[PDB]
Amino acid sequence: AVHHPPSYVARLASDFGVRVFQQVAQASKDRNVVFSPYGVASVLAMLQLTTGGETQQQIQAAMGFKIDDKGMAPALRHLYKELMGPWNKDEISTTDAIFVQRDLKLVQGFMPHFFRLFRSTVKQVDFSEVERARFIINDWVKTHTKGMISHLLGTGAVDQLTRLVLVNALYFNGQWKTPFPDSSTHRRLFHKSDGSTVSVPMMAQTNKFNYTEFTTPDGHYYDILELPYHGDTLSMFIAAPYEKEVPLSALTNILSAQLISHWKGNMTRLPRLLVLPKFSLETEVDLRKPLENLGMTDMFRQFQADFTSLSDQEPLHVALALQKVKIEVNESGTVASSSTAVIVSAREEIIIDRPFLFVVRHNPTGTVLFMGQVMEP
Questions:
Q1: Fewer CB within 10 Å: N-end or C-end of the chain?
Q2: Using CA atoms, how far apart are residues 169 and 339, in angstroms rounded to an integer?
């Protein structure tokens, strides 16, 4: 059943990534956000190897662990093997790469140490050939997201001073354990934050669902539904206020990877009619401010950043950190992918007709792969 090491680091990773999400959401009160906690946790994990001094200590203290501590790296490998194994039935793919300047002088034993811990691709690039460089990176991401995220990097995102790009790619294809009958899909009104409404396609089905009620500090009641994928390892949690007028921010402000696990332990299966909007969302988040707010200021500062674990040839700083994410939810299931990059450079009836939260979780490990807020399907 459940294995301690994969679950140990899943828990650390998920808490971190979910705290990042909370920052993104607090910065976009009334817009759709889809986000990948495991995506960002993955890349920042690799970044721990490349950094030193205070830059490194800030990352580590924010993540709650040190990648080079005994067992941590092996646990992360075991985690993604666990996530990808056929026994889940529903399909997860997750891949890590790094693209480094061809003529960059690296610290001795780096690359071998990095390959030993992460087993990822290392590829030599010539960032001076700028357009070819970001074609190389964009094409790798596209491949490892099954065509879903093709153009991760825009123009300018990479230039002559680029020395290293660390990238994760994640792909999820899940089938509901019980699909929503197509004949049950109908137009219905959806109530937005600003009090107005809009008609959107919605899916309905009656089933015995994992469920619990939950209340915020202000007393407000929330419905928490757990929707299973056919493999019985993955689920999507849906959380929405009982009343129409309560802002979703109430939930997101107290949302933790810990509170999600508490929800899971407190669910009971009850017969219910569920009407849930179909939604297809795509987001592109700049991670700079989110990560600074969690205490990683040094790495972005070109006169303060420490990448001495990677190279002493010259001073390096993070020019850009981003995540692209996409998700499609329909009658048959859920398709989701995300790609996160850090660029291092030189110099009863439950009708969900109001904004709601979702979390895609692998339950044996406790890994949050995706989460978002749907403000308008």
A1: N
A2: 5
Residue 342 near residue 327 (C-beta atoms within 8 A): no
Tokens found for residue 253:
């402000």
Gap between the Cα atoms of 5 and 3, Å rounded: 6
Q: Residue 243, Cβ neighbours under 10 Å: how many?
A: 10
Name, in order, each residue with C-beta under 8 angstroms of 338's C-beta and a sequence gap of 6 or more: 35, 36, 39, 145, 149, 168, 169, 170, 323, 324, 325, 326, 370
The experimental method is X-ray
CA distance 234 to 336: 13
Q: Looking at domain 1-171+282-326+337-339, does it have CATH number 3.30.497.10?
A: yes
Question: Which residue, among 338, 308, 45, 9, has the nearest Cα to 166 in the 3D structure?
Answer: 45
Resolution of this PDB entry, in A?
Answer: 2.0
Q: Is there a contact between 188 and 199 (Cβ–Cβ < 8 Å)?
A: yes
Query: How far apart (Å, rounded) are the C-alpha atoms in residues 156 and 107?
Result: 28
Per the listing, tokens 């929707």 go with 227
Residue 279, Cα to own-chain centre: how many angstroms? 18
Closest CA to 318 of 51, 41, 53, 45: 51
DSSP 196-253: -EEEEEEEEEEEEEEEEEEE-TT--EEEEEEEEBTTSSEEEEEEEESSSSS-THHHHT
- Residue 128 CA neighbour count, 13 Å, CB half: 3
The residue among 275, 213, 220, 273 whose CA lies nearest residue 246 is 220
Domain boundaries, given as residue ranges, for the chain? 1-171+282-326+337-339, 172-281+327-336+340-377
Instruction: Identify the CATH homologous superfamily for domain 172-281+327-336+340-377.
Output: Alpha-1-antitrypsin, domain 1 (2.30.39.10)
Nearest-5° angle of CA 272, CA 274, CA 278? 165
According to DSSP, residue 377 is labeled -
> Which of 215, 169, 176 is closest to 325 using CA atoms?
169
Pairwise CA distance, residues 373 & 360, whole Å: 12
